[PDB]
Design an enzyme around this catalytic site. Structure first.
Site, PDB file in Angstrom:
ATOM      1  N   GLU A  72      -0.030  -7.958   1.170  1.00 52.78           N
ATOM      2  CA  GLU A  72      -0.350  -9.070   1.327  1.00 52.78           C
ATOM      3  C   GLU A  72      -0.372  -8.802  -0.676  1.00 52.78           C
ATOM      4  O   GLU A  72      -1.596  -9.382  -0.693  1.00 52.78           O
ATOM      5  CB  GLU A  72      -0.856 -10.265   1.280  1.00 52.78           C
ATOM      6  N   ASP A  73      -0.447  -7.798  -0.907  1.00 51.00           N
ATOM      7  CA  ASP A  73      -1.121  -7.055  -2.278  1.00 51.00           C
ATOM      8  C   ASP A  73      -2.362  -6.760  -1.796  1.00 51.00           C
ATOM      9  O   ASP A  73      -2.907  -6.158  -3.006  1.00 51.00           O
ATOM     10  CB  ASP A  73      -1.061  -7.509  -3.526  1.00 51.00           C
ATOM     11  N   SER A  74      -2.567  -6.425  -1.118  1.00 51.19           N
ATOM     12  CA  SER A  74      -4.219  -5.917  -1.112  1.00 51.19           C
ATOM     13  C   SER A  74      -4.387  -4.444  -0.852  1.00 51.19           C
ATOM     14  O   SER A  74      -2.846  -3.501  -0.794  1.00 51.19           O
ATOM     15  CB  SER A  74      -4.709  -6.063   0.605  1.00 51.19           C
TER      16      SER A  74
END
Ligand SMILES: [Mg+2]
Ligand SMILES: [Zn+2]
Ligand SMILES: [Zn+2]
Ligand SMILES: [Zn+2]
Lengths: 137, 56, 118, 144, 56, 56, 186, 49, 56, 92, 100, 65
Positions: free
Chosen positions: A3-5
RNA sequence: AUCGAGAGG
DNA sequence: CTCTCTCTCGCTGACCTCTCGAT
DNA sequence: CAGCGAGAGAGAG
C-alpha cells in the site's frame, strides 16, 4: 512495502541519510501595560508567581532566558517572564513552555529591543530528526 | 492551441494522444492530458462534497 | 426586404395601399413624401438562413495566418491558393460544410455538392 | 554562420539570457518599482489641492513630488539609522521607507513634510540589496 | 450539530498508519506511548487483585 | 515488441484514416444524419468511437 | 484615472426567441426602467431613425438586423425630439431633462469619456453593443465566454498597494482638511 | 476607424520591434472581425516568443 | 467514515514503533492507504461497552 | 533588435506559432521506432515560434523529471508535494 | 411497440411520426409577406402557376410559405396534409392554397 | 552540506577522496567518471555520494560572523 | 478566543 | 368576475486531522 | 439554485 509503504536500510540510515536539522524559534516580548507598568523578564519566583506552568525552571538562568547548549524536552521552560498584577502572588507567569513533543538543544537566544522599546527574546532550539517508521517520503 | 490551424477537427488538435507514456508525449498532448487531469481533480473534490451532502 | 426611408428626413417609410388602382407605395410619417414600391414584399422571415455562411470576406482575409490553406482550387479563376473555413454561423444545427475563399479573384466556392446558391 | 538558423539547443541560451536579465520573480519587482517611480506621483497629483474659501479667502495646499527614502528606521529614543532586511526580520520590525512630499501652501484672496512610512519590497530599486554585490549580500547576511 | 450530534471524546488517539504482515487481521498495533497514555477503568476483583497490584 | 509496436501504430493510422474519411464526407455534405441528431453530433460520436476503439 | 468602482451598462433583447414585440432596451445607471435604444439615441442627439440604425448597423446589406431593429424604431417614433427623450428619464420638468443630461455625460460609458460634446462617440459604441447583441441573436456569432485569459486581468502587488495608498492618502488629506476647518487661528 | 489597416499594423509592429511602441503593449487585429484592439493595459500575462 | 465498516473493533497488540499497525486486508473496508494516512482509535471505558464492541 | 516579441492572450489569438524551430525549416521516410510520434505541423504560415515547449511548465513542474512520460495528475501531486519536501532553503 | 409487432421498422416510424410534435416552424424554410393586388393574378410566377393548377379561385396581402422537401419527407405529413392542418386551424377566417 | 564520510549503502569511506577528486578533475581536465574510477568508487552508490553532493559549507563559510 | 491562510489524507 | 393556474422574487441550506499567521 | 410559497394577475373559464 505494501500500500505504497517503503523499506529503508537501517545501515544506510545509521550513516547519515535523510537526516534533518529541525530548528524551532519561540518568541516573547516584554509587554508594556503603560503607566510605568511593564512585564519583567526574570526567572519566576514561585511565591511571587501564581499559576506557573508545571515545568522545570532549573534550566532557566537568573535572567529568565535560557542559554545555548542546554537540553530541553517536554515542559522545560525556555523563556521566563512575569506579569505584574494590580499582595501575595503579585506576579503571574508569562513563561513560555517548550512544546510537549519536542526534544531539543538550544541553538541560540537573541535579545533585542523593538521600535516601541520593549525587549524581544527569540530562542532557537535545534533537534536532529532521523528517518523513523512512518515518516513520509 | 495557438500552434494548430483554425477550424481543425483533426484528432491531434481535438486532443487524441497517439503516443504512449513510454514513448513520450508531445507538448500539445501533455497540455490536453493536463486539461483532462485538472477536470478529474476538480470532479474529485467537489463531487465528494455533493455526495457527502447526499449521504447525510 | 429592402427597407426605405424618406430621402429628406431619413425616418422610416410606412407601407400604404391605394385601393382604387390597387398599388402599394411607402409613405414617411415625418414628411408627406410617398414613393411607389419596387418589390411587392412587405416582410420576409427566414426560419432557416444560409446567410452568414460567408462573413466579412475581405481580400485581407487571405493574409491571416490562423485560417488554413486548402489543397483544392477554384474553377473560376483557377487559383490554387485558397483559404477554407467552417461556416461562420454558429447554430444548434449546423452543416460541417467547408467554405473555400479564393486568395486571388475573390471567388467563394462551397464544398457542398447539393447547393450552389450564393 | 550568423545566417544559419537556430536549433533547439540554441533556444536554451536565449532562455538563460532572459533569466539573467529578469530573474524568476521579475514580475513582482517590476510592478512594485513602477508603483514607486510613477504611481505615487499620480496618486498625489490626483486630488492634489484641497481648498476652503470664504470671501466675506481661499486656502490652497498643493503637493510637490513625493520623495521615498532609502529604507531606514528611527529607533524610538534613538537616532534614525539605516534598516536592513536581516536586522528587520530579527527585530520584528517592518521594512520601511519614509514618504516625504514637498508641500506648497498658499492663501488665495514649507520644507518636506513626511506623509508616512511605506513598506518596501525586497530587491526593489529602493531596497539596498538590489544595488549590493554578492559579497555585500553575504556581509548583509541576506542570501545571494 | 457541532456539539450534541458530535463531540470531542476523551480516550481518543490517532496515528499515521502502516501495516504489518505478521499482525493478525482482527488486532491493531498500538504504539507503547499510546498504550501508556490511554487508560481503562477496571474494578478490583479477587481474580485481578494480584495483576492490578503489579501493574500499579 | 517492435513488431507489435508497428501493429499498434498501424492501428492508430487506420483509425486516423477513417476519421479523415468521415471528415471529408462531412465536408462534402453527403452524409446520413440520425433522426433527432445534428450532423455534427453524429460526426462527434463516430470520431470519438473510432479513437476509443483504436486505443482499446 | 476616475473612481475605480464600476458602472455596468446592460443592453438586452426582450421577448422569447419566437415572439412578437422584440425590443432592444438598455438600462441607464440611475434609471428605474430600461429605456429603448431609440430614446437613448434621441437624447444623445442622433435623431434620424435611419441615422440611429446606421449607428447600430455598419452594413447596408444585411436585412435581418434592420428588421429586428424596426420594432424599436416603432417605440422611437413616439418621441422624435431630444428634449422629450431626456424628459422620459427616471422617476420623481427641465430638471428631469437636466438630470438625464448629467447622467449621459458621467454615468453612461464613463470609460470612453465623461466630458461634454462627445455624445456621438458614445452613441457609436452603443450601436456597436447593439450590433453584438444582434449577432449573438442572429447566431452568426457565439456568446462571449468569461473564462478567456485575455479577459482575465491579474492584479500584482503594486496596483493592490496603489488602491489602499490612494484611500489612505484621501483619508489623511481629509483629516488635514478637518484640522484646517476646526481652527481659524492656526 | 481606419482603412488600409495592414500597412498601419506593419508600421506598428516595426515600431514595437524598434521599441518606440512599448514592447509590453499588445495590439490585436482580426480581419474577418474588421476590428483592431490595442491594449496598453496592465495585468495581462504575456509570453516571450 | 462512510460505513460501519469504517469503524471496527480491534484487539490491542502493543508494538514498539510509533505507527498504528493494521493487517493488509483490513485496509480495504477502511479505505486505508499506507502512504501518510492517519487512523483513529477509541477505547471503551465500560464492560458493557467493551462487550458491545467485541460482540458486534 | 525585434528578434523576440511579447504576446498577450488576445494577441495570441491572432498569431500562429510553432513549438519547434526545426518545424519551420522546410521538410521535403525511415525513423527510429522509439521516438514519440509527432504529427507534421501541416501549417504553412508561422508568425512566431515558441522559445521552448518546456516553458509552459511551472517551477515545481519544471522540477518533475519526465512529466511528458507520466500521467498529468501525478505531476500535479508532485508539484504540491515538492514544496513539502525538505531541502536547504537558504545559505543564511 | 404494440404486442406481437417487432421488426416493424415502418410501424415504429408511423408511431414516431404520430408522437413527434411537428410544427409549421419545423418544416418552414421561410415566411414572406407579399402584396398581391389581384386574387387571380399573383406577382410571383410560381404562385401564378399554382393559381393555374386550380381552376377554382378577402385581402390583397398574401403570406407565402416555403417548406423544405427533405424535412417534409422525414415527417409523415404530405404537403396537402400540412395545408389541410393550417385550414382547419384557421376556421376559414383565412383561406389557404397548397402547392402539389 | 559537507562531504559524507561514507556511502550510505556500503559504508565505504568517501570523505578521504573528495578533495583529491576535485583537484583531479581540474588538474587533468579529467571527466568525472574517470576521476571516480581512479578514486576506486567502482560501485555506483559510492559514485553517487560524490557526484550528487554539493558542498554548501563554502557558502556558509562566506558569512562573516 | 476570533478571523484568515496554508497543508494532509 | 374570479379564483386559478401562471408567474413571481425570496433563503437555504449545503469527513476528520495538522501547522501557521494575524487581530 | 430550485423552490415552494405566499402574493399578485390577467384569464379562460
Ligand atoms: Mg495517507
Ligand atoms: Zn420624411
Ligand atoms: Zn478564383
Ligand atoms: Zn557504496
Amino acid at each position: 512495502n505494501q500500500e505504497d509503504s517503503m523499506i529503508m536500510n537501517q545501515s544506510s540510515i545509521d550513516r547519515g541519510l535523510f537526516r534533518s536539522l529541525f530548528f524551532r524559534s519561540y518568541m516573547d516580548q516584554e509587554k508594556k501595560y503603560g503607566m510605568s507598568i511593564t512585564e519583567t523578564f526574570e526567572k519566576p519566583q514561585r511565591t511571587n508567581t501564581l499559576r506557573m506552568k508545571h515545568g522545570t525552571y532549573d534550566k532557566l538562568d537568573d535572567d529568565g532566558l535560557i542559554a545555548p547548549g542546554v537540553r530541553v524536552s517536554g515542559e522545560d521552560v525556555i523563556i521566563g517572564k512575569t506579569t505584574p498584577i494590580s499582595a501575595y502572588h503579585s506576579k503571574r507567569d508569562a513563561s513560555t513552555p517548550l512544546r510537549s513533543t519536542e526534544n531539543g538543544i538550544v541553538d541560540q537566544v537573541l535579545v533585542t529591543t523593538n521600535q516601541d522599546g520593549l525587549k524581544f527574546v527569540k530562542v532557537r532550539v535545534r533537534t536532529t530528526k532521523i528517518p523513523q517508521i512512518g515518516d513520509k517520503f | 492551441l495557438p500552434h494548430f490551424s483554425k477550424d481543425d477537427y483533426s484528432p491531434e488538435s481535438k486532443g487524441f494522444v497517439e503516443n504512449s507514456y513510454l514513448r513520450g508525449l508531445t507538448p500539445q498532448e501533455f497540455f490536453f492530458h493536463a486539461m483532462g487531469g485538472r477536470e478529474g481533480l476538480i470532479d474529485t473534490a467537489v463531487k465528494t462534497a455533493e455526495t457527502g451532502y447526499i449521504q447525510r | 426586404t429592402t427597407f426605405r426611408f424618406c430621402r429628406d428626413c431619413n425616418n422610416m417609410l410606412y407601407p400604404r395601399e391605394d385601393k382604387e388602382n390597387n398599388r402599394l407605395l411607402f409613405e414617411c410619417r415625418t414628411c408627406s413624401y410617398v414613393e411607389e414600391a419596387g418589390s411587392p414584399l412587405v416582410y420576409r422571415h427566414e426560419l432557416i438562413t444560409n446567410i452568414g455562411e460567408t462573413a466579412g470576406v475581405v481580400q485581407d482575409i487571405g493574409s491571416d495566418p490562423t485560417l488554413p490553406r486548402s489543397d483544392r482550387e477554384c474553377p473560376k479563376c483557377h487559383s490554387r491558393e485558397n483559404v477554407f473555413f467552417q461556416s461562420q454561423q454558429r447554430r444548434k444545427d449546423t452543416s460541417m460544410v467547408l467554405f473555400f475563399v479564393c486568395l486571388s479573384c475573390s471567388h467563394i466556392f462551397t464544398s457542398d455538392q447539393k447547393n450552389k446558391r450564393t | 554562420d550568423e545566417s544559419a538558423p537556430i536549433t533547439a539547443e540554441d533556444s536554451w541560451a536565449v532562455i538563460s539570457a532572459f533569466f539573467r536579465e529578469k530573474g524568476l520573480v521579475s514580475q513582482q519587482l517590476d510592478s512594485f518599482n513602477q508603483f514607486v517611480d510613477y504611481t505615487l506621483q499620480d496618486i498625489i497629483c490626483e486630488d492634489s489641492t484641497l481648498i476652503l474659501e470664504q470671501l466675506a479667502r481661499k486656502y490652497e495646499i498643493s503637493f510637490g513630488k513625493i520623495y521615498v527614502t532609502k529604507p531606514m528606521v528611527n529607533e524610538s529614543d534613538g537616532v534614525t539609522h539605516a534598516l536592513y532586511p536581516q536586522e528587520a526580520r530579527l527585530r520584528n520590525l517592518t521594512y520601511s521607507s519614509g514618504l516625504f512630499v514637498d508641500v506648497k501652501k498658499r492663501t488665495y484672496e514649507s520644507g518636506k513634510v513626511f506623509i508616512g512610512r511605506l513598506p518596501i519590497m525586497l530587491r526593489s530599486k529602493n531596497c539596498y540589496l538590489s544595488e549590493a554585490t554578492e559579497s555585500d549580500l553575504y556581509k548583509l547576511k541576506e542570501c545571494p | 450539530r457541532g456539539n450534541l450530534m458530535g463531540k470531542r471524546v476523551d480516550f481518543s488517539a490517532r496515528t499515521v498508519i502502516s501495516g504489518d504482515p505478521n499482525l493478525e487481521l482482527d488486532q491493531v498495533g498500538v504504539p507503547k506511548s499510546i498504550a501508556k497514555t490511554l487508560t481503562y477503568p477496571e474494578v478490583v476483583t479477587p481474580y485481578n487483585i494480584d495483576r492490578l497490584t503489579q501493574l500499579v | 515488441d517492435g513488431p507489435t509496436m508497428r501493429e499498434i501504430t498501424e492501428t492508430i493510422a487506420e483509425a486516423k484514416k477513417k476519421v479523415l474519411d468521415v471528415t471529408k464526407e462531412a465536408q462534402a455534405n453527403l452524409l446520413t444524419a440520425k433522426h433527432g441528431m445534428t450532423l455534427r453530433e453524429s460526426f462527434e460520436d463516430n470520431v470519438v468511437r473510432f479513437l476509443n476503439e483504436a486505443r482499446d | 484615472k476616475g473612481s475605480r468602482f464600476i458602472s455596468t451598462l446592460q443592453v438586452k433583447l426582450y421577448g422569447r426567441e419566437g415572439s412578437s414585440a422584440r425590443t432592444i432596451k438598455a438600462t441607464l445607471p440611475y434609471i428605474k426602467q430600461d429605456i429603448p435604444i431609440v430614446i437613448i439615441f434621441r437624447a444623445l442627439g442622433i435623431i434620424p431613425d435611419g441615422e440611429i440604425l446606421e449607428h447600430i448597423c455598419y452594413d447596408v446589406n444585411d436585412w435581418q438586423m434592420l428588421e429586428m431593429l424596426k420594432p424599436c424604431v416603432e417605440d422611437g417614433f413616439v418621441i422624435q425630439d431630444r428634449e422629450t427623450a431626456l424628459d422620459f428619464i427616471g422617476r420623481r420638468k427641465e430638471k428631469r431633462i437636466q438630470y438625464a443630461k448629467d447622467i449621459l455625460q458621467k454615468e453612461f460609458l464613463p470609460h470612453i469619456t465623461q466630458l461634454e460634446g462627445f455624445e456621438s462617440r458614445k452613441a457609436f459604441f452603443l450601436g456597436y453593443m447593439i450590433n453584438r447583441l444582434l449577432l449573438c441573436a442572429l447566431d452568426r456569432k457565439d456568446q462571449d465566454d468569461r473564462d478567456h485569459f485575455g479577459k482575465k486581468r491579474l492584479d500584482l502587488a503594486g496596483p493592490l498597494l496603489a488602491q489602499l495608498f490612494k484611500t489612505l492618502f484621501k483619508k489623511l488629506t481629509k483629516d488635514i482638511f478637518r484640522y484646517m476647518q476646526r481652527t481659524v487661528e492656526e | 476607424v481606419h482603412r488600409n489597416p495592414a500597412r498601419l499594423m506593419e508600421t506598428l509592429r516595426t515600431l514595437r520591434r524598434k521599441g518606440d511602441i512599448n514592447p509590453e503593449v499588445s495590439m490585436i487585429r482580426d480581419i474577418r472581425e474588421k476590428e483592431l484592439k490595442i491594449f496598453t493595459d496592465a495585468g495581462r500575462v504575456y509570453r516571450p516568443l | 467514515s462512510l460505513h460501519k465498516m469504517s469503524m471496527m473493533a480491534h484487539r490491542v497488540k502493543v508494538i514498539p514503533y510509533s505507527t498504528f499497525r493494521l493487517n493488509l486486508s483490513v485496509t480495504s473496508p477502511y479505505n486505508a492507504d499506507f502512504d501518510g494516512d492517519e487512523m483513529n482509535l477509541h477505547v471503551p471505558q465500560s464492560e458493557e461497552t467493551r462487550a458491545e464492541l467485541s460482540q458486534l | 533588435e525585434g528578434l523576440v516579441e511579447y504576446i498577450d492572450a488576445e494577441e495570441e489569438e491572432s498569431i500562429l506559432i510553432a513549438m519547434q524551430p526545426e518545424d519551420l525549416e522546410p521538410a521535403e521516410l525511415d525513423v527510429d521506432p522509439a521516438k514519440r510520434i509527432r504529427v507534421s505541423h501541416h501549417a504553412t504560415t508561422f508568425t512566431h515560434c515558441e522559445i521552448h515547449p518546456s516553458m509552459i511548465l511551472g517551477v515545481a513542474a519544471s522540477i518533475i523529471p519526465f512529466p511528458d512520460h507520466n500521467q498529468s495528475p501525478r505531476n500535479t501531486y508532485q508539484s504540491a508535494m515538492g514544496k513539502q519536501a525538505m531541502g536547504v532553503f537558504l545559505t543564511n | 411497440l404494440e404486442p406481437g409487432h417487432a421488426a416493424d421498422q415502418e410501424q415504429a416510424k408511423l408511431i414516431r411520426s404520430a408522437i413527434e410534435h411537428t410544427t409549421l416552424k419545423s418544416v418552414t424554410i421561410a415566411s414572406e409577406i407579399y402584396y398581391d393586388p389581384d386574387p387571380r393574378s399573383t406577382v410571383i410566377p410560381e404562385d401564378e402557376e399554382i393559381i393555374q393548377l386550380h381552376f377554382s379561385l378577402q385581402s390583397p396581402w398574401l403570406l407565402r410559405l416555403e417548406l423544405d422537401r427533405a424535412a417534409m419527407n422525414d415527417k409523415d405529413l404530405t404537403m396537402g396534409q400540412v395545408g389541410e392542418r393550417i385550414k382547419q386551424t384557421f376556421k376559414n377566417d383565412l383561406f389557404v392554397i397548397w402547392s402539389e | 552540506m559537507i562531504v559524507p564520510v561514507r556511502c550510505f549503502s556500503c559504508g565505504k569511506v568517501v570523505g578521504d577522496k573528495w578533495e583529491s577528486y576535485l583537484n583531479l578533475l581540474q588538474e587533468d581536465e579529467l571527466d568525472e567518471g574517470t576521476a571516480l574510477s581512479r578514486l576506486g568508487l567502482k560501485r555506483y552508490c559510492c559514485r553517487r555520494m560524490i557526484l550528487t553532493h554539493v558542498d554548501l559549507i563554502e557558502k556558509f563559510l562566506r558569512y562573516n560572523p
